[PDB]
Design a protein around this ligand. Structure first.
Ligand SMILES: C[C@@H]1O[C@@H](O)[C@@H](O)[C@H](O)[C@@H]1O
Ligand SMILES: C[C@@H]1O[C@@H](O)[C@@H](O)[C@H](O)[C@@H]1O
Ligand SMILES: C[C@@H]1O[C@H](O)[C@@H](O)[C@H](O)[C@@H]1O
Ligand SMILES: C[C@@H]1O[C@H](O)[C@@H](O)[C@H](O)[C@@H]1O
Ligand SMILES: C[C@@H]1O[C@H](O)[C@@H](O)[C@H](O)[C@@H]1O
Ligand SMILES: C[C@@H]1O[C@H](O)[C@@H](O)[C@H](O)[C@@H]1O
Lengths: 343, 344
């Protein structure tokens, strides 16, 4: 078997106090510690997830009744271990996916489905040849329709913005405040609706001290926000998602504990205390959160990432509870391996 | 600060019972969880270590009184996250470093210093265009001088060999026995001397059950050896090294515990029980061991790898003890970060 810390739970079926003996799955055609991007339709009707296969291609898992796997970018397009982040607007007929080339330049994949189209193509961002820090992660927001903002870590470790809109094409945007940890995970959200202008932008990142911090944009410019987590694991995965709950934006910020369990902090008329959503240890690796608002005004959340041993998980927050069934989405060949908890 | 499990020690200056509050270093120009290859001179006079920088270049740290950093392969030569493994012979004037291209093909960097030369160049292996599983690690041995063997994982997850020698150039060698874990770390050693022929080859790897296993070559062919560890962490780093002690090969096999501490098992007239060499938790990431026989007949070992938060460590076994002070080798810009031990 493989050994796992006996104090940690590797799966939903682990013993109550930690792993004793169980079987877990290794999906070896998923890149180990793959990046993840995702977007659930604002209607909740379908889901998109993007990830990197072991062979370096970028793939898509689309849910509509069942999951269907496809390849969106061939090997050679993306850095091995590229970050990923996605946009969806229209409300839901226009998709963009951002990634890094093997030369650490921003790249964009486009999927247009407006009016029944189905056009996939390389975006104009590629031609700007924007070089980023080689360990940069990526975030992005959209507003007013097709006004786009892409966030990355520059070579001097500051967070930086690139902009699209107004007929200008892609142009350098702001340099953000704060002192980001080199290689920090980042996640940016727009609290205002996809068609509204101005946006209300929040970004979450880890600082050089290890704390988690918040970027805030409102008209007038960028500032460091009130969200402060004094300590978090080194290079903790971070992902945030926002949707309106009872007509007020509900921000959900997710990161990992030292036990590699998922911690959530919610902003909704103020920040609520961080709380662990479940006690199952995920692989310490990129996660991706997405959300939508039901007709009753409540907000569903989905989180994707890597579960032990190497499987794509889906965690579901629905009707106000985290569901005990955590799903796995197969992306290729798999082997089952016995796991034993060791002290 | 950053949070770290309070039951684990992040450094040699951590509190006796774990991490409480301390400062640790982040070298952000070292690729996070870089691969490592290494070779100490058989005289012990100098040391070579290779690693991947954040920009994807492959660099070298050479010790002779002090460490000197130099770049050997520019960005674009190597897969981001490439494995690395090295050969040294002549006894100590000819170096080969194996890595993967961004298209998952075996590559070879050559450094020839015989006759006072200083030639660095791409090896003939590159032209064979040997595609490997994208998660493959790499091992290699040399014997009889320039008879080379390179070990990798093929697309069906078997371990495979490529050979060089006999005027035949590079050719496909054996397919090895056993059922290797996809992406297993691998480490191959020659129990016989660099200028002896035939070799006596051992390779250490993790199987689909999670156990650790051993490949054996002796005249007659390949077989699965007697070294078995029934359970080990998933995708545990593995590195082995051999040097003679009292005229018999001393194999040292290193892997990680679930606490990410380094475990050693020695073979020398039989296998000895595995034992933890120190109680400091490394980053669970590639390690690289090397060894030489000291003038008093004892065997020195050096291990390189990633220590918290992201620095290149050197662990030293010398005069029969693992030295308590674990060094770091700077490879670029660094920042200090406070670390606090936290409970569940
Ligand atoms: C909204 C715009 O759509 C296409 O024109 C892309 O080429 C641009 O880069 C941008 O994504
Ligand atoms: C020993 C041999 O040295 C050089 O000729 C290389 O090009 C070969 O690939 C091999 O390493
Ligand atoms: C919404 C704002 O649009 C402006 O053009 C940018 O300069 C700001 O940084 C921000 O993205
Ligand atoms: C919605 C709130 O906006 C403010 O500007 C921030 O300081 C808070 O942390 C939060 O994001
Ligand atoms: C030492 C032996 O040399 C032979 O040529 C190879 O076929 C074997 O696999 C092994 O490497
Ligand atoms: C040196 C010994 O040779 C034998 O063949 C192997 O079975 C042992 O595990 C060990 O390597």
């Amino acid at each position: 078997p493989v050994e796992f810390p006996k104090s940690l739970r590797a799966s939903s079926h682990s013993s109550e106090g930690g792993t004793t003996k169980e079987e877990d799955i290794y999906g070896y055609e998923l890149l180990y510690r793959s990046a993840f991007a995702s977007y659930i339709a604002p209607t909740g009707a379908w889901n998109l997830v993007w990830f990197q296969a072991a062979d370096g291609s970028i793939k898509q898992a689309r849910w509509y009744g069942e999951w269907v796997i496809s390849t969106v970018l061939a090997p050679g397009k993306a850095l091995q271990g590229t970050p990923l982040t996605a946009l969806l607007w229209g409300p839901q007929d226009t998709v963009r996916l951002y990634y890094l080339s093997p030369q650490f330049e921003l790249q964009e994949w486009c999927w247009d489905t407006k009016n029944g189209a189905d056009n996939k193509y390389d975006g104009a961002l590629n031609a700007a040849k924007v070089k980023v820090a080689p360990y940069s992660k990526l975030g992005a927001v959209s507003f007013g329709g097709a006004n786009l903002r892409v966030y990355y870590q520059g070579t001097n470790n500051k967070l930086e913005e690139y902009t699209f809109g107004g007929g200008q094409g892609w142009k350098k945007g702001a340099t953000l405040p704060g002192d980001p940890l080199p290689g920090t995970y980042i996640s940016f959200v727009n609290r205002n609706k996809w068609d509204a202008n101005p946006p209300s932008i929040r970004g979450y990142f880890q600082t050089v001290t290890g704390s988690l911090a918040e970027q805030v944009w409102e008209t007038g410019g960028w500032r460091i926000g009130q969200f402060v987590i004094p300590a978090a694991p080194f290079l903790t995965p971070i992902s945030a998602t926002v949707s309106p709950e009872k007509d007020f934006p509900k921000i959900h910020v997710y990161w990992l504990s030292v036990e590699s369990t998922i911690i959530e902090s919610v902003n909704w008329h103020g920040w609520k205390a961080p709380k662990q959503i479940d006690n199952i240890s995920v692989v310490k690796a990129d996660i991706s959160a997405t959300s939508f608002t039901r007709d009753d005004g409540t907000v569903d959340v989905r989180i994707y990432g890597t579960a032990q041993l190497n499987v794509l998980f889906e965690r579901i927050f629905r009707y106000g509870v985290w569901e005990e069934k955590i799903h796995s989405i197969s992306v290729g060949k798999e082997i089952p391996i016995e796991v034993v908890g060791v002290a």
